[PDB]
């Protein structure tokens with residue numbers, strides 16, 4: 114089959130054939146679309162075909178499909194599965210697998226960078242202290258004093274499901290959130306529950322508005338352990354505005370390294386439950402969502418007051434005006450401190466070029482419009498005008514339940 | 525079976541059962557989502573009519589009544605005999621209001637029950653169509669205090685006698701390709717404009733020429749008519765702080781009136797059913813004025829504001845965008861012409877959604893279209909999960925007539 118997508122601004126039409134390789138379900142049906150829904154131990158039986166599909170993809174990528182090396186590897190893996198019920202990936206396969214999970218992430222607008230991922234193999238890790246050391250090294254490497262480099266650290270794969278490795282933090286670096294008895298929230302509201310867990314586990318909370326959370330690490334299914342990331346490895350940027358000198362006095366700042374640490378990486382049927390990865394920020398993530406969501410730092414009112422905007426009626430678009438200035442401040446601050454960041458115009462323009470290239474060399478590029486289009490100025494970015502097809506390819510990054518809802522405590 | 529939608533800002537979860545009544549397809553499958561794609565017999569008729577009538581009689585608390593059963597048999601007899609049937613005025617009004625109620629891409633549905641329905645099923649000629657349209661425009665415009673309305677022309681018979689309004693909206697500006705290779709006017713209307721000239725219209729070749737109506741009756745060739753100039757309310761655009769804005773010489777019409785969709789009620793198809801409400805600010809300021817394929821005025825405005833257009837990161841496009849939109853809202857409000865900003869419109873849709881889940885068990889909604897084209901996440905709909913599905917009565921897309929008409 115062939116499916117076409119059209120760009121309504123340029124009339125350019127692209128043809129997709131890659132969707133035929135899609136196996137996983139989307140959540141939609143011929144009668145209902147769930148395109149805006151955020152969240153719509155295997156057996157030997159189901160494992161070898163997953164392994165085979167992957168190795169076939171890998172060997173084709175290196176132009177050795179059907180070779181003796183390819184056939185020997187399939188045989189080697191088949192024998193390993195029947196013998197041990199699982200199998201180990203070669204270093205080359207792990208790297209190829211991690212890169213493709215990113216290439217296949219339909220919600221990621223930064224995929225033009227997919228082939229440049231630095232992969233850290235942490236499959237020899239056995240304890241939480243070992244995980245801490247690997248993570249510190251990841252943060253230092255990725256941060257690179259402001260010249261950010263994309264990277265992923267991969268811990269041991271799932272075995273029987275009772276020995277999982279997990280990073281309990283949602284991101285390696287985040288700010289604590291504290292619920293006050295008067296019902297107000299200090300810090301980042303998004304992390305109140307995790308913050309409470311850390312405190313219960315023994316963390317001594319400084320109780321400020323921007324406290325870097327400690328790492329809570331679980332190795333081999335054991336109870337998680339607390340570790341503080343060396344302060345000198347956590348790069349932060351004070352936010353100020355190029356024309357408004359009062360902006361700095363809002364006391365805002367943000368960390369430079371965005372590092373998702375709670376997703377699961379699937380490669381050839383194998384499940385990597387601890388696979389923290391990082392790239393660099395697109396400005397709106399901080400300026401629009403982290404600072405302006407009503408449920409996050411919610412700074413729109415304070416900023417609009419300072420700009421002395423007419424806040425008597427929404428039709429003056431005071432919220433829209435303040436939003437633009439806040440985002441100008443974020444980009445200006447990061448750039449001033451020489452910390453990598455990309456604005457939404459540059460990022461979306463690059464994604465469109467990446468998408469077109471993928472359709473041509475790969476036959477498609479699964480993309481989730483709802484997530485790709487920036488949270489501000491949507492229609493003045495090219496992606497708003499681009500029809501997209503969303504489907505799931507493996508290797509892939511998947512959501513998994515927070516560990517505190519499933520962990521069997523040992524005491 | 526029972527689906528749930530969550531609002532990530534408030535945590536409120538709603539349960540949807542209404543989708544179970546969905547009949548038409550979405551274009552998606554379990555393997556691929558096409559959520560961002562813009563355009564994804566007597567034996568057939570009676571089933572559709574029954575489905576509709578059952579919902580109508582249920583709405584009037586007379587389901588399973590004798591009147592319900594009588595009407596059901598009356599229509600059945602009529603279909604078998606005439607291969608079609610005629611809706612009672614009450615059914616037509618209910619159907620039209622529900623087609624709006626079911627429009628998943630419309631953010632202004634909290635207004636659905638207040639639609640004024642003009643029954644033009646007795647219309648027979650193109651001149652008759654012109655008169656009905658002039659009356660709709662005058663009524664809906666109401667000197668600036670707009671009122672929602674729909675005018676319904678004769679239903680499809682055999683497909684060779686279809687009534688059609690060739691225009692995409694009752695009121696739009698012409699588009700002309702110039703020697704410069706550039707485009708004068710609205711680029712979106714270049715093809716239709718040429719069809720009008722090809723038909724006789726004397727184009728004024730200006731930037732904002734109100735197009736004439738091309739009306740088709742009983743399947744005959746379409747005819748041109750000029751909407752009385754005095755019935756077309758326009759608003760000159762100026763900014764409340766930038767005196768130079770008025771120098772851009774921009775203006776827009778006050779009445780948005782989609783005229784090319786097909787209204788389906790109880791299996792019957794009404795190919796000419798122009799309807800109108802009022803504008804959401806972003807429609808004009810973001811899309812019409814800033815789309816690169818439309819008036820594309822961002823650069824001009826940025827220049828007048830003296831913004832640094834060297835680097836995209838200065839967010840000059842974003843700053844100019846907000847100003848253009850502040851000007852549109854200010855101009856309409858200053859002239860007492862109805863208009864709603866995206867914050868107010870989206871807040872009302874969320875309230876409408878809650879009402880609908882509580883009293884109907886759901887509300888089909890297309891997130892891709894409901895979320896405004898600017899400041900997405902500072903509006904509540906961005907944080908609202910939605911389920912998109914098709915219910916009838918409905919408003920459907922249909923091929924432009926010039927690509928199907930046999931002259």
Ligand code: HEM
Nearest residue numbers: 215218220221222223226263264390391392393394395510
């Ligand atoms: C190099 C710079 C990168 C940029 C500019 C970028 C940008 C983005 C942005 C803007 C989002 C949306 C975030 C949100 O709204 O929560 C995102 C999502 C995502 N990115 Fe990227 N990304 C980059 C690197 C990476 C890397 C290194 C990986 C993996 C190896 C990756 C995997 C993903 C995934 C899986 C999602 C969706 C997560 C979810 O569903 O919550 N990205 N990216």
Ligand code: HEM
Nearest residue numbers: 624627629630631632635672673799800801802803804919
């Ligand atoms: C009363 C005020 C109304 C408001 C504020 C409103 C607003 C909107 C907006 C902003 C859109 C998107 C337009 C676009 O991006 O092209 C829209 C779409 C739509 N509206 Fe409403 N609307 C109103 C009344 C109506 C009425 C009276 C009807 C029908 C009787 C209606 C039927 C629809 C339909 C079918 C669509 C989607 C059209 C498409 O798919 O292209 N609307 N509306």
Ligand SMILES: N=C(NCCC[C@H](N)C(=O)N[C@@H](CCN)C(N)=O)N[N+](=O)[O-]
Nearest residue numbers: 283371373374375390391392393394395
């Ligand atoms: N730019 C990035 N942004 C990551 C954004 C993560 C986002 N702040 C977040 O909280 N994501 C949720 C997922 C929400 N669906 C999580 N990680 O638990 N990633 N990067 O590698 O460069």
Ligand SMILES: N=C(NCCC[C@H](N)C(=O)N[C@@H](CCN)C(N)=O)N[N+](=O)[O-]
Nearest residue numbers: 692780781782784799800801802803804
């Ligand atoms: N506010 C309204 N806006 C509708 C605007 C229609 C839009 N400008 C338009 O051109 N739609 C195309 C379809 C868009 N894919 C058409 N009807 O030919 N509607 N109203 O009744 O109040």
Ligand SMILES: C[C@H](O)[C@H](O)[C@H]1CNc2nc(N)[nH]c(=O)c2N1
Nearest residue numbers: 149150151483484906907908909
């Ligand atoms: C309900 C809706 O799906 C939700 O708010 C989505 C919309 N688009 C998004 N897009 C990005 N990049 N990130 C998000 O968290 C979201 N949230």
Ligand SMILES: C[C@H](O)[C@H](O)[C@H]1CNc2nc(N)[nH]c(=O)c2N1
Nearest residue numbers: 497498499500560561562892893
């Ligand atoms: C390609 C994409 O579907 C297209 O640009 C859509 C997105 N959302 C939209 N939303 C509204 N209200 N109106 C539109 O014309 C569009 N265009």
Ligand SMILES: OC[C@@H](O)[C@@H](O)[C@H](O)[C@H](O)CO
Nearest residue numbers: 283303304305306307308375
């Ligand atoms: O406070 C805990 C939250 O950070 C956590 O529940 C996240 O919402 C979850 O990881 C999904 O992002």
Ligand SMILES: OC[C@@H](O)[C@@H](O)[C@H](O)[C@H](O)CO
Nearest residue numbers: 692712713714715716717924
């Ligand atoms: O110039 C003709 C166009 O306006 C017309 O073909 C529209 O694109 C069509 O009605 C869909 O909006």
Ligand SMILES: [Zn+2]
Nearest residue numbers: 141146552557
């Ligand atoms: Zn879908």
